[PDB]
Amino acid sequence: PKVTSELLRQLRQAMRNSEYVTEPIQAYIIPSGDAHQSEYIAPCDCRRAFVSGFDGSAGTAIITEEHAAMWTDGRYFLQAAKQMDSNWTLMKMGLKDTPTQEDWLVSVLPEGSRVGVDPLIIPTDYWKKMAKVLRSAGHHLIPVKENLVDKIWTDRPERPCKPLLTLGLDYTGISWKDKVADLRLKMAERNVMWFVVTALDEIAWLFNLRGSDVEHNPVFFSYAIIGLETIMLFIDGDRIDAPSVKEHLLLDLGLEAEYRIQVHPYKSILSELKALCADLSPREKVWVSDKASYAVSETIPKDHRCCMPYTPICIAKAVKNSAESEGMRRAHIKDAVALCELFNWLEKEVPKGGVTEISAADKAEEFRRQQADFVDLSFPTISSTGPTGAIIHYAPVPETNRTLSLDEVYLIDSGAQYKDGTTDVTRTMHFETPTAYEKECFTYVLKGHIAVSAAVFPTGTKGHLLDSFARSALWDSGLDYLHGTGHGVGSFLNVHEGPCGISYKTFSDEPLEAGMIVTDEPGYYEDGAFGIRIENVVLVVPVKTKYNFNNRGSLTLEPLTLVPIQTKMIDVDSLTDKECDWLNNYHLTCRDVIGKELQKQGRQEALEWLIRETQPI
Amino acid sequence: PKVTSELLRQLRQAMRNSEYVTEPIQAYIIPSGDAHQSEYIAPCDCRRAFVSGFDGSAGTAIITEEHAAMWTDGRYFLQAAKQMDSNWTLMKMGLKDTPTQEDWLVSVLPEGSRVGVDPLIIPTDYWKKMAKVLRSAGHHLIPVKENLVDKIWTDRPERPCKPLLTLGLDYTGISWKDKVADLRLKMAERNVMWFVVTALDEIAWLFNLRGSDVEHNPVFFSYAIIGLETIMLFIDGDRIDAPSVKEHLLLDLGLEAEYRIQVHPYKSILSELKALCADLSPREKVWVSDKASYAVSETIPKDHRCCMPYTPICIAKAVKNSAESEGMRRAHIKDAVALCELFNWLEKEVPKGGVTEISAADKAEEFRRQQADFVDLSFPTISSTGPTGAIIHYAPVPETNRTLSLDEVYLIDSGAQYKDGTTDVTRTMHFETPTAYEKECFTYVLKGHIAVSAAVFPTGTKGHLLDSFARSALWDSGLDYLHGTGHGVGSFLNVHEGPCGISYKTFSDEPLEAGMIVTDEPGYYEDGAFGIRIENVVLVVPVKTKYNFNNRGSLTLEPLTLVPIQTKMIDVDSLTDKECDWLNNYHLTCRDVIGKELQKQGRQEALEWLIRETQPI
């Protein structure tokens, strides 16, 4: 484990330093998250890993005068125990006797204690829950503005500050000026004077900009404040002065004043927000996400604070316009070309005995990089053979890197960001003869996949109402999968994007409408044996029906992912005619669209593979 | 219309009377609801009808110095306009230009106005929404303790105060002492000192008592406060002194003190709650429903107020024990006997031309009353032929009472309270030859009904996740129904009971578990032509499956309703084998269970009908 005895000594001393706290605090909370509720935390924000040695993706540390405790989930019980030294106490989340953070605190704190946390990195949700319980026991939760880990972290990496990319109308369908105008119409109809934007993907979409400050998600560290007559963009770096960016943002015009973007330092967000709020008149509202940091939300006086589950940006960007959806189609056509090359290569090379989980993942990236306007992977590839495939959240380590073979089911989940769009696809396959049980499970999963993709439903049906269609065949045999059926997908933006989706986990998802894009990804995982998942990105599209009730219209799903589904894995005699017709048609569509592209790109061998793999059942 | 000019004059004067208000109020709100959020409002509480002349089931009146406005929904636009005189302004809810109550108020009120409402008859939800908007415009929402309509309502009927009925262990499965003990264990594990019970069905279930103060729902006006060491029942009437009731409630013992029920006047609820709250120490909590009246909730100081979506009584009573579920089976067997007699009678009598929607409803009640321990109808019968059937909320009027015929689809939805249990059943039928479209729609509805009833799903699946199964066949052809698929059902208690159910309207319903009872009732309504609904009460039951994932087990539904589904209405060639087998089996189960009962009861003619109507397809 990392030796953290001296780090803890220094942190405990910082907890008492008058420069940071008016009075000493008896406990300090170090969460995983960053200031924007990011999905992938930048190295500079991996404070919990720094103080503990535990560097998994999830975990909350709490340091007291006497104790250092770490809460993490099942993925990490073993990792945390190994990585942390004897200073640390492991709190195994999910287990029956594991105390909550707040109840643990009450049990270890002396009378009338102060508990500190950096307010920029927790939401109000968490603040309220913690503050309540602590207050009951005579304690106080204190926002400590200076991050205490940063104070002791001598060799803390700089915040990533990478180039910006501009996206033109061909890609976005609508200008940033028009997006801001649309947003202001929504603000006016609600007496909102100011809208504070804290989610990095929302800022990227609003200004038609992209970046690479965060892994996978093509976003950049920033905030924005939108007024009715002004715009304030909080961003660091000379990147903002690149000629393409100046031109795109109209920064060297003598333009109309309401579209003049004021560029402020990234650190200035709270002080500029405080100054605007100081000047509010009684009925004036400030819109903020209910997901925003406590520091940002608390800056807005309660009387003026208009919290919302989903900002109007989240709602607008959920529906892809024709430029965006055409980009998604293009991105998927390129991605399928790359996967035809990959799967052909796998069929040739796996029997030779040298293909490993990592080398196959490497090869997937290699083929993707050949395609025009490839940017990066949209998430880390999952490449799992045999028992590894049952581990839903499995990520490579060289010492448990398995060799692909003719005797094990292989699952590959992978995806890319292209300038045109964003992909996410899982296929499960076998290189010789699968067992009947492997085929049985695959076929239940496929039945669910088709039940969702072929579903016809009224406009405005919430996606969660499609989730059980994916599960019916599994459920009938006593099987299930412990994940959601689908999520929204961004347009050259986060592969995991709300507010639409298909899950049993929420009823508050947005009604499905034409232009939304989601995944359809049922699976089945047999611990110690194999895993199966069949995942496509699908576009919500209008569809004509026999009858027309209550007006409104109906919708169905159209796959953008065009990659064969391996027929040897299917118990064909168990399919309905509808399912058989669906797969045959899907396969001919793959052959049409991807085959044309393969021929255009001169990729004969991959085209031959695609034709073999798209034969009817 | 009713002449309400003088009533309004008197109400306007009451709004300024120092005996009722410290200062005059400029507006007064008169809602539909009563103090317990009852489903069926007692005549004495029909205040909105009294002041306006409009006596539909839904509507909110607001009286100002200058205006009298009525908000109601689509069912009642015509009724309200006809029943109210020229003093009244109709506010058509749902329509685009119809203002909300609170925005209408701001538009008609003078500066710095007070708006009054009786706090006993609105929830905090409504109070908060109204108070906020009014406060913004410089106005104040005032709780006015003395109901102002009652002050002017000279011939107001007395509150119903009907006999109480006791239910023994054979019916309830568990004593009230044991229910109170269970509730107290839940209170202790939450540091709750007091639990205020405001829902009439919860009080009935807790004390194993029933009544008839409210139409249909077998409940009695009361409140209860449960402490850890005391019980307080707020109830009026010498009914509490009936020997059976004294014995049941252990009121003439020298019993252990924690089960001594203190009987207080019904009106004393607020003053006794205020006195208990005066004595709370800092960390002591009082449990109240978030549905409770503002008057009750506000009595509890905010620091001590522990609001909950579902009380622990609501959660416990949702799961029927074996005594309760066996009662439900018995009640359904009796109800089916009555319906076999009814449907046989219909087949004989409709061709003679004298059967009307009302006479058929009357006959349904007549046959039910023959059965042992019939108590009353569980809701008003819906009896609709032809176009009436498309009107989801249709209730008889003698001048639109249609004659049943050989040329129209007939829908009958009916149900009873028996001492043993509660029923709710819809059947749709035809007395000669239906059209292909009528059969097409019926078959889509039946497919949905079977998809739900035959569903197999993991324990703890939320019922809302079954809703789309009922709709798939309709949806595929562009049809739908604008109501939920099912609701929970009480045990000799409200036919409409949560917190479980099957609806697109909520994601916050409770996970399904063995012992819950719900309806399965898809339909289809063709405006100006016909309606179809096929409704059974079903019990959630365990079921063995081929495989066993994640432990937990699986569940399915077992119909308690045993009434034939008419095969002439079905496009049989369109059914799957699963659906055909389901119906054949269901019909033989009807024949077994109900046939045995008919034979035992000596009902030969009805038995002959049942055998004809349960032949295989």
Ligand SMILES: [Ca+2]
């Ligand atoms: Ca084999």
Ligand SMILES: [Ca+2]
């Ligand atoms: Ca006919």
Ligand SMILES: [Mn+2]
């Ligand atoms: Mn994926």
Ligand SMILES: [Mn+2]
């Ligand atoms: Mn995915």
Ligand SMILES: [Mn+2]
């Ligand atoms: Mn009914």
Ligand SMILES: [Mn+2]
């Ligand atoms: Mn019903």
Ligand code: NA
């Ligand atoms: Na999930």
Ligand code: NA
């Ligand atoms: Na409904």
